[PDB]
Amino acid sequence: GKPKVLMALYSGGKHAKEEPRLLGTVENELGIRKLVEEHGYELVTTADKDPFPSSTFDKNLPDAEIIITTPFFPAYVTKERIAKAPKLKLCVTAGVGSDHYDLNALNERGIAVLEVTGSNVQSVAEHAIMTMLILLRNYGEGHAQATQGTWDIAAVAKDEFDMEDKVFATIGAGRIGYRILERLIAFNPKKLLYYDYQPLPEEAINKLNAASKLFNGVDNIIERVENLEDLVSQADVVTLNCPLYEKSKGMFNKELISKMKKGSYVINTARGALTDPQAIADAVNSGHIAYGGDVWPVQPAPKDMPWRTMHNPYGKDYGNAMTVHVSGTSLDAQARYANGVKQILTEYFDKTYKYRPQDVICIDGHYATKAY
Ligand SMILES: NC(=O)C1=CN([C@@H]2O[C@H](COP(=O)(O)OP(=O)(O)OC[C@H]3O[C@@H](n4cnc5c(N)ncnc54)[C@H](O)[C@@H]3O)[C@@H](O)[C@H]2O)C=CC1
């Protein structure tokens, strides 16, 4: 009877009653209901996004003009689902990361795909650093020892290392990847390596070196490596900070992992499909690497997903730092991307269409950025 805004968020349950700041939940609807109903649209919000095609999300596709998803609990907007939404015009991401859309299928229909770029770049950077510290310093066994009542110092320390004088390398030096490099300077790394299809800005290189000089009296800390297999070969820690597209899917396979040093570390706070998931679990279970991160290949992750029971040979709490996808949905980030979805909808409803250039991933049938 009215044009539909179709929104898929994660459930809040009792959590939403104890925290009004849980804006990114079904119960609170990002606080866009007043704006949506002010423009005569219907707002439908569900956490029921799986399975295809019997979910509430599927059953509201026919009349969906706007679809809002969130990457931490993403309704996968596939070719099949696009074909059932004949009046779809706009897809908004409550957050950053639009891998859960079939962007080429949306381009063939001339669909606009909008993110809130930057709303969690610092939130993810913190999560990557946190994961680096947790793995290198063996917080897993150190925290375990405290919880299970023991005091086996040697069991913790034997796999406990300092961040200092380690080689850190990022695959991707974008907004997030560079912010990790910044937060690594004061930890005094041996070297900071990076890999990107483009150079780091002139002026970004000097900023990092300026902090290395200031904090640690070391110049030339940042350095570009051109061969991916070289970059991982020299690194103690590698961070994935690139988006998921066809050429990057599966890039972290058995061949690349095994070209890293034993006892190295892999951090992936970007997208889970950047790895070969079984190759990661195998290398963790064999002790070749430690792995941590918050992004998974399919979200929600199956309960028998190998990453949930990954652990180095030393024990269950070694080399494992998985969390569910939460880094970009911190309470502070939720306020940012809730407001960014509101800005995007206001521009669309008022037919002004003067979206922030960074927010646009796809528009008028062309990928309007190199952010894939
Ligand atoms: N875990 C979370 O909560 C979130 C995760 N992400 C994910 O991480 C990605 C990082 O994006 P941002 O840094 O925010 O934006 P961005 O605009 O800087 O995009 C990432 C950058 O990485 C580089 N890059 C792209 N493809 C690459 C490849 N195949 N290999 C190496 N480098 C490559 C490019 O410089 C690109 O601009 C997002 O696209 C998203 O998939 C980002 C936001 C939230």
Cα of 184 from ligand 1 centre, angstroms: 18
Is 176 labelled a binding residue? yes
End-to-end CA separation in angstroms for the chain: 35
Domains of the chain: 4-117+332-367 (3.40.50.720), 121-318 (3.40.50.720)
Nearest residue (by CA) to ligand 1, atom 23, is 172
Bond prior to 300 in cis (omega within 30° of 0): yes
Interacting residues of 1 by C-beta distance below 8 A, sequence separation 6+: 42
Q: Is 23 annotated as a binding residue?
A: no
- Residue 19 CA to residue 289 CA, distance in Å, equals 38
Q: Distance, CA 171 to ligand 1 centroid (Å)? A: 9
**36 C-alpha to ligand 1 centroid (Å):** 30
Positive or negative torsion for Cα 305, 306, 309, 310 = negative
Angstrom resolution of this structure: 2.7
**Determination technique for this entry:** X-ray
Active site residue 299: yes
- Report the residue among 176, 324, 359, 360 best suited for mutation to probe ligand 1: largest number of ligand atoms under 8 A from its CB: 176
Say if ligand 1 is within 6 A of residue 242 CB. Answer: yes
Does any ligand 1 atom lie closer than 6 A to the CB of residue 97? Answer: yes
Q: Which of 320, 325, 334, 336 is catalytic?
A: 325
For residue 144, what are its two tokens? 């375990």
46: left (phi over 0), alpha (psi -120 to 50) or beta: beta
